[PDB]
Design a protein around this ligand. Structure first.
Ligand SMILES: [Zn+2]
Ligand SMILES: [Zn+2]
Lengths: 370, 550
């Protein structure tokens, strides 16, 4: 309703006015099928510019990082009615965010069905299950003999709504979810995607084996990019279409302008002799009229010796100088980039010509002396 | 030669009732609305100045009632006094209202008050007391330190902003958002006064950490206007940030290209190329977002006209500046072409990127024959896992000038047994969305025309009516352009080109269309360094004489 005599009943059923002069309300407030104790003292008139509001310590843990919010809302909100709307809305927010603490599953469907269904698959399949039982991650095999993993993140109702599927491989995966579908169903869909992309995988595996793939290190199955090295201090980066893998990619070369120019010319001249009945390597070798190095150096292949903020060597004369005092990062930077960076952080403090604060990559103490 | 008084006498009462609103622009609203209406205020002042200049003062009482109050209100408003020449014009208005020999008491009082207000604009100490006292002490006139004073005032605020910028989420003095908006409002009226331009560029780089914009778009549009009319020349980093925070500025500037290819310099592609390279579009189109927005406005124009040769030309040029800008500023960390060109095979692009500067004249037929194959794969075998359709693979084919144009000029060189692939290619270019039925018809029409033309070339220099026969529908522009290629290419031309031109020039549209053809061809040859000097001089001559006829 308009007025907060019926509208306040309808929108706060469990707030029982104790006093005749409706100054103390007491009892429960509702949110996400959960009721909370709440005791809300007004002054002698209906003015929230001055009011008390006490809570259960339950509710106060759940209003943590909102205290100023609520105090401002008491001062800024015209009526009690709207105040309660704002307060519920804010509870709404608070719980859904802290979703890790709050999940009472209906066992009779859940924990039994999930067991039945993992039995339906086979027990070699499942590889990880979380003790909140929210996450699972499953395994599948190629005709090749490659493992590909699938994460599922599951809700209070598994069989009702979709399970959130998180997947590696580079085309967007489609799972037709019904209430009738189950783990075996989405698993068969996932196998279908595997056996479909078989060619693209063979291309990637063939490359990684018979060449010095250099930049993506331990490649995922999602990566379309392969910065291959060849000769010395020249490289080719090659971005591939999965749907037509053997077909021609967008490509270009890094290194010496005097070394690369001839290869570009030669490529532009032989590029009509690309053929999607050969392999990518068997096309590249005879198009560019070359053989590749199979790991000319496997230990000191390359460590990216660039700024790790701006990713340039030679920013206005300056060199990658300032490093991390850490064995696991070692990452060089620039004087300019690291100063601009650390000034900005809240963790940074500046002494006379010194700036203390966190390495961008590893969050360990790093010192900059201007 | 009708009204003279009336429109100005109305707009007078409008502006006087507006000046009284503003009243020294010490507040937000008075400033924003002044910022807007000032320019029209200036034009009003031009018409007013003409009127007061042609006539003489103290004699006439036309608008003399409250002209005084208008010029008071004007001058004590500093946002007025800051704009291009509004000051200069106010000076002139006052110099019109002066008198040489004042006669009644009123005229002397007037003229004194006139010197007063000029002295208030130019030479008044409406500034901090101690600095006045100190300088007067050192025996300095405002004139000799104002400049350095201004310079220091600016470098201060620019510095301040750069530390605001670098302290992003730090427990340290946060430049007041209100004050930044304040400065921005003051950048507008004196953008073309060189002693702010560091401030500006500091504003555009130094965005800071807000979800909300802080600057008011009257700032962005003042700046945009001034970039395009070349009153500003900032560095390019300034203007990428400008585009990348105010979309209607980046609209406003790609539309200010369109005025250039429509009105001013129809088919002077040198002039168009130089405007694109001086504008910073290429470098700003290295950011994939601004590429996508710009090519949307290009797509909207490809449709309004159904494949206008003039917009095809501007694309070809723009793309060539862009591609050279990509290569240049893309050593490490560049976005993959399915990012700029998402609605095609990256395969096809990677072919079409290879320029003909780097291939021999003889191997271009091979290149086109490869393109025909992959386009036919994309269009005819229009299945899942492809382009969305034929139109998209065409809008790609446009963005490469060179390849679409060279087909006709290569057909004439291989007119004896023409390759079916080239006939596919050219038919596709002049007509997508036909059915195989309509493409085969077009191809065989062109094949018969190749027969007639090769007979005519291997014959002597013949009439123009023999060509008018085959000229005499859906495939007209194809045949026209191929025919012009024939004229320029064969040495049987240079004699009977005029003879066909005169007849083919039915309308002015055909004339302009062929002119665009010829400008494109000259630009194309002079780039690629491929030439018979006969054809070059002939095209130049024809183009020169036909641009007069229109
Ligand atoms: Zn750097
Ligand atoms: Zn580190």
């Amino acid at each position: 309703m308009a007025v907060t005599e019926a509208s306040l009943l309808r929108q706060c059923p469990l707030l029982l006015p104790q006093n005749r002069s409706k100054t103390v309300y007491e009892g429960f407030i509702s949110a996400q099928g959960r009721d909370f104790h709440l005791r809300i003292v007004l002054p002698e008139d209906l003015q929230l510019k001055n009011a008390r509001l006490l809570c259960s310590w339950q509710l106060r843990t759940i209003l943590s990082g909102y205290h100023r919010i609520v105090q401002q809302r008491m001062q800024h909100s015209p009526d009690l009615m709207s105040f309660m709307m704002e307060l519920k809305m804010l509870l709404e927010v608070a719980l859904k965010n802290r979703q890790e603490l709050y999940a009472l599953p209906p066992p009779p469907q859940f924990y039994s069905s999930l067991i039945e269904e993992i039995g339906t698959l086979g027990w070699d399949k499942l590889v990880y299950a979380d003790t909140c039982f929210s996450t699972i991650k499953l395994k599948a095999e190629d005709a090749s003999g490659r493992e590909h993993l699938i994460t599922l993140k599951l809700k209070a109702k598994y069989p009702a709504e979709s399970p959130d599927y998180f997947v590696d491989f580079p085309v967007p995966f489609c799972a037709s979810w019904t209430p009738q579908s189950s783990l075996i169903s989405i698993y068969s869909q996932f196998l279908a995607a595997i056996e479909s992309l078989k060619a693209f995988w063979d291309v990637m595996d063939e490359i990684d084996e018979k060449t010095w793939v250099l930049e993506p290190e331990k490649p995922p199955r999602s990566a379309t990019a392969r910065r291959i090295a060849l000769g010395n201090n020249v490289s080719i980066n090659i971005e591939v279409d999965p749907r037509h893998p053997t077909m021609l990619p967008e490509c270009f070369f890094l290194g010496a302008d005097h070394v690369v120019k001839p290869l570009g010319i030669k490529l532009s001249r032989n590029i009509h002799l690309w053929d999607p009945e050969n392999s990518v390597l068997q096309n590249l070798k005879d198009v560019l009229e070359i053989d590749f190095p199979a790991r000319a150096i496997l230990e000191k292949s390359d460590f990216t010796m660039d700024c790790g903020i701006c990713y340039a060597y030679q920013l206005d004369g300056t060199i990658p100088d300032q490093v991390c005092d850490n064995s696991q990062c070692g990452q060089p930077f620039h004087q300019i980039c690291l100063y601009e960076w650390l000034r900005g952080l809240l963790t940074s403090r500046q002494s006379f010509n010194i700036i203390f604060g966190e390495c961008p990559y590893c969050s360990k103490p790093i010192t900059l002396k201007m | 030669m009708a009204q003279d008084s009336v429109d100005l006498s109305c707009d007078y009462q409008f502006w006087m009732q507006k000046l009284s609103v503003w009243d020294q622009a010490s507040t937000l609203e008075t400033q924003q609305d002044t910022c807007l209406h000032v320019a029209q205020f200036q034009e009003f002042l031009r018409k007013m100045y003409e009127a007061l200049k042609e006539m003489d003062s103290n004699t006439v009482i036309e608008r003399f009632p409250t002209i005084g109050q208008l010029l008071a209100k004007a001058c004590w408003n500093p946002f007025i006094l800051a704009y291009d020449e509004s000051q200069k014009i106010l000076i002139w208005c006052l110099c019109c209202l002066i008198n040489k020999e004042p006669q009644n008491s009123g005229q002397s009082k007037l003229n004194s008050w006139i010197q007063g207000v000029l002295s208030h604009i130019l030479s008044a100490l409406r500034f901090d007391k101690e600095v006045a006292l100190f300088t007067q002490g050192l025996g300095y006139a405002p004139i000799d330190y104002y400049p350095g004073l201004l310079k220091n005032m600016v470098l201060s605020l620019a510095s301040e902003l750069r530390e605001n910028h670098l302290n992003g989420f730090n427990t340290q003095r946060r430049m007041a958002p209100e004050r930044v908006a304040s400065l921005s409002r003051v950048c507008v009226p004196l953008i073309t006064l060189t002693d702010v331009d560091p401030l500006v560029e500091a504003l555009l780089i130094c965005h800071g950490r807000e979800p909300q914009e802080i600057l008011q778009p009257e700032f962005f549009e003042a700046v945009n206007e001034a970039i395009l009319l070349k009153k500003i020349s900032l560095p390019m980093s300034a203007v990428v940030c400008l585009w990348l925070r105010h979309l209607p500025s980046l609209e406003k500037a790609m539309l200010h290209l369109f005025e250039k290819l429509i009105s001013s310099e129809r088919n002077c592609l040198r002039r168009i190329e130089c405007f694109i390279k001086d504008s910073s579009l290429p470098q700003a189109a290295c950011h994939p977002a601004i590429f996508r927005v710009v090519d949307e406005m290009f797509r909207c124009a490809l449709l309004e006209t159904d494949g206008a040769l003039e917009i095809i030309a501007t694309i070809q040029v723009f793309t060539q500046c862009f591609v050279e800008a990509l290569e240049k500023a893309s050593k490490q960390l560049r976005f993959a072409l399915k990012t700029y060109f998402p609605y095609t095979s990256p395969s096809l692009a990677m072919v079409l990127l290879q320029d003909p500067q780097d291939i021999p004249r003889g191997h271009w037929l091979q290149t086109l024959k490869h393109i025909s194959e992959l386009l036919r794969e994309a269009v005819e075998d229009q299945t899942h896992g492809s382009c969305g359709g034929p139109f998209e693979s065409w809008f790609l084919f446009i963005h490469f000038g060179g390849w679409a144009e060279m087909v006709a000029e290569q057909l004439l060189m291989s007119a004896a047994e023409p390759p079916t692939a080239l006939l596919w290619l050219l038919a596709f270019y002049y007509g997508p969305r036909d059915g195989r039925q309509q493409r085969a018809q077009t191809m065989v029409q062109v094949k018969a025309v190749l027969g007639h033309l090769l007979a005519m070339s291997r014959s002597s220099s013949l009439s123009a009516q023999d060509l008018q026969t085959v000229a005499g529908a859906p495939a007209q522009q194809l045949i026209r352009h191929l025919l012009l290629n024939f004229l320029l290419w064969a040495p049987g031309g240079h004699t009977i080109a005029w003879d066909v031109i005169t007849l083919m020039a039915h309308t002015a549209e055909i004339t302009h269309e062929i002119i665009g053809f010829l400008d494109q061809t000259l630009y194309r040859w002079n780039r690629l360094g491929i030439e018979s000097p006969r054809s070059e001089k002939l095209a130049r001559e024809l183009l020169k004489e036909l641009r007069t006829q229109v």
